[PDB]
Amino acid sequence: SIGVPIKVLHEAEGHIVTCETNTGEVYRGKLIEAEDNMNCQMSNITVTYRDGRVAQLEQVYIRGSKIRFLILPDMLKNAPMLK
Amino acid sequence: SAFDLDVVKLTAQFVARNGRQFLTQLMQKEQRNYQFDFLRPQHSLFNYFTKLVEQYTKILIPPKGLFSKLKKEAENPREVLDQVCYRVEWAKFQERERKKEEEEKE
């Protein structure tokens, strides 16, 4: 079936999220497109490359395998999943 | 009755230092224009004053703590265990004698 976490991610699409990849790549940007495999294709993202030298790219796309973390909109705290 | 308890304890303590059954600080303290309403033997609180006096006189014995030291009950769980077992055995013997008396009464 479908994971409630992945439902929170799909509710976290279109708005600003902040993923953190396995190499420390911190990509805080508009999460455009995500799927069941957590493959997050985001736009206007700020990718920090783990270095603190954070740059701004557009149409970035990080897979789900590297996802150490992903801050979704906290405005989803009243999402229908947790209640 | 906390003031009354303080007064009863004070009476037991001040009678602990008297010399005889008539030689205390209470014989004249009764007629000394101050209310002492426990010394009367019709008042059951005379038993409570006598129990306070018994406790004071059992603590004012030579083994009560005047000039000696208690060491067998004060660092001796073995002596404490001997005394506890003897108290429990005396209680069992008292109950057994009571049961014999009760069978006799029935």
């Binding site: - | 303590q13 600080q25 000394r32 603590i59 703590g65 005047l66 009950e73 004060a74 404490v80």
Partner: protein, 434 residues
């Protein structure tokens, strides 16, 4: 501050209660072995209370030594008596009863109903003090010791029976070197054995027994306690013989024996003491370690179900005739049809007659009462909670309209020539003016 009267009486009462509570704890029987160990621990706590009172009282001779002359005066008295009466002639308007002088020590040094626990005996138990590999005095926790010995030795041919036989003998030929680090593991083993022996009996003299064992190690262990007929006397730590007692006295106070070795009478002292204490503990609980080996062998030899279990430790209703009803009667009366009522806690009624009667039955009337709705004919055939609450809103509003609120609707004559609710008129009437 009568350091001889008030303190002596309070301490005497406390110690008497402690002795009586020990007598009661020893006069009551034990039913679970953890119950017996916890009763022993509580008796230890009560005896500790009595001993603490005894020690607090044994020092009460520095002011008694000054008061022995003034307490015995036959001339003094009623002066200090009237003074104490004046000091206790404060306001006795504290109109309250309080038996909390001596009935409170009985409730502190007593037992409890859900478990035998005293006042200070509310948080003391065998739960943080007894091991589940033992059971609070059932078995022994030595699996860690076997794993530690096996990690120290590095051998894959070491079984629990060989380990237990090596650890049970009293002074036999070792399996590991005493100048090696396995003596370090023997130190932890002696610590665990001493902790188990002490936690097995909180009532027996701990200070006196430790003192007797220390006097033994001082006088009879280091002075040739295992004699011979070099074989005449042996050293326990250094591992050297002695031809005679004079030779042993010469070879104990010598130069190589004291500090001319890592196994001298300076360095190996704690190790020899821990080894002697472990041997003494094995000899004192030699039946206990044997029972623990019995439990380990029973677990290793039993079957698997017993190992797990040891580690874990017609279609129709009745009638007045007394027999079931014909199946066609059951269908004819609709007793095969189930009706549910949400107001009744989702209770299922069998057949239309039982389901019509239930609206007047206590279960439905109680459900309606829990909702704050009066059980009335208006709620007949209402089974859902939402429908009952809703229907209630409309009915409340209707009775609201038919009922006439006099004060809320009456029209009163303002003296100037105005009209306002009678309630407002009377309120304002008094309301300074009207």
């Amino acid at each position: 501050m009568e350091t001889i009267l008030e303190q002596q009486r309070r301490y005497h009462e406390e110690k008497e209660r402690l002795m009586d509570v020990m007598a009661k704890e020893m006069l009551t029987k034990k039913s679970t072995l953890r119950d017996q160990i916890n009763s022993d621990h509580r008796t230890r706590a009560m005896q500790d209370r009595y001993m603490e009172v005894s020690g607090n009282l044994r020092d009460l001779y520095d002011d008694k030594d000054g008061l022995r002359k003034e307490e015995l005066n036959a001339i003094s008295g009623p002066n200090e008596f009237a003074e104490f009466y004046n000091r206790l002639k404060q306001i006795k308007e504290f109109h309250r009863k309080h038996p909390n002088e001596i009935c409170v020590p009985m409730s502190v040094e007593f037992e409890e109903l859900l478990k035998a626990r005293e006042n200070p005996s509310e948080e003391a138990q065998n739960l943080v003090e007894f091991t589940d590999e033992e059971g609070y005095g059932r078995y022994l926790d030595l699996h860690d010791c076997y794993l530690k010995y096996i990690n120290l030795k590095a051998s894959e041919k070491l079984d629990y029976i060989t380990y237990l036989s090596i650890f049970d003998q009293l002074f036999d030929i070792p399996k590991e070197r005493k100048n090696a680090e396995y003596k370090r593991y023997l130190e932890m083993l002696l610590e665990y054995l001493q902790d188990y022996t002490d936690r097995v009996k909180p009532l027996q003299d701990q200070n006196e027994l430790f003192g007797k064992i220390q006097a033994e190690f001082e006088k009879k262990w280091e002075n040739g306690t295992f004699p011979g007929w070099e074989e005449r006397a042996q050293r326990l730590f250094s591992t050297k013989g002695k031809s005679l007692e004079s030779l042993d006295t010469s070879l104990f106070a010598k130069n190589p024996k004291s500090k001319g070795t890592k196994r001298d009478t300076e360095r190996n002292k704690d190790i020899a003491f821990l080894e002697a204490q472990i041997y003494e503990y094995v000899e004192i609980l030699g039946e206990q370690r044997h029972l623990t080996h019995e439990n380990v062998q029973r677990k290793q030899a039993r079957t698997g179900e017993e190992r797990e279990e040891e580690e874990e430790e017609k279609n129709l209703p009745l009638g007045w005739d007394g027999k079931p009803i014909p199946y066609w009667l059951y269908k004819l009366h609709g007793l095969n049809i189930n009706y549910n009522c949400e107001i009744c806690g989702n209770y299922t009624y069998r057949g239309p007659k039982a389901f019509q009667r239930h609206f007047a039955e206590w279960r439905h009337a109680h459900g309606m009462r829990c909702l704050g709705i009066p059980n009335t004919a208006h709620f007949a055939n209402v089974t859902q909670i939402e429908d009952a609450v809703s229907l209630w809103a409309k009915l409340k509003l209707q009775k609201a309209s038919e009922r006439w609120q006099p004060d809320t609707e009456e029209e009163y004559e303002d003296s100037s020539g105005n009209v306002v609710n009678k309630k407002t008129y009377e309120d304002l009437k008094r309301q300074g003016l009207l």
